[PDB]
């Protein structure tokens, strides 16, 4: 069937390519994140720094709508005043490294928007199952 197809790369392998092709593989970029006489203190503080970072990320993802989905969607509409880009060009033109410098200004606000949105949705569905 397949004579020669693109198999898979290492973690950060796709990161030069476009975001549409890079979104096919996330599990590789996710798995290489946890694990694979004064010096023991340096190794132990390295390991606990690693698990501290990963647990912070898991909690920050948990307080939004999606705990463990690894791909989410939500109910906050995109304001075009941040990005001013077409839909047709971003998924077939740019990389994430290219993307991050463009969206670097508008951060730390979108997170709070997600927080408030998830909070209001939870209290409204709470009221729904309250009258249920």
């Amino acid at each position: 069937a397949v004579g020669i197809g693109a198999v898979f790369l290492g973690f950060l392998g796709a990161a030069g390519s476009t975001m549409g092709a890079a979104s096919m593989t996330l599990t590789v970029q996710a798995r290489n994140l946890l694990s694979g006489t004064v010096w023991g203190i340096k190794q132990l503080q390295a390991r606990v720094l690693a698990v501290e970072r990963y647990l912070r990320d898991q909690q920050l993802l948990g307080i939004w709508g999606c705990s463990g989905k690894l791909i989410c969607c939500t109910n906050v509409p995109w304001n075009s005043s941040w990005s001013n880009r077409n839909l047709s060009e971003i998924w077939d033109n740019m990389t994430w490294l290219q993307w991050d410098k463009e969206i670097s200004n508008y951060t730390q606000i979108i997170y709070g928007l997600l927080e408030e949105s998830q909070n209001q949705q939870e209290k409204n569905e709470q009221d729904l199952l309250a009258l249920d």
Binding site: Q126, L129, A130, D132
Partner: protein, 52 residues
């Protein structure tokens, strides 16, 4: 300061300085702080019910 242990019906109450421990100097400054531990996950009754 330190009061003298005066029995036997005397109206005066003398006082004297006494150093003693080194702990009292820190107790002069930590007289305003206790340390408490957070506990999440309370539980309370209300009128809602989870659907199947």
């Amino acid at each position: 300061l330190t009061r003298d242990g005066g029995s036997t019906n005397s109206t005066t109450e003398t006082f004297r300085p006494g150093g003693g421990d080194m702990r009292d100097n820190w107790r002069s400054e930590l007289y305003k702080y206790k340390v408490v531990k957070i506990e999440p996950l309370g539980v309370a009754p209300t009128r809602c019910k989870r659907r199947v």
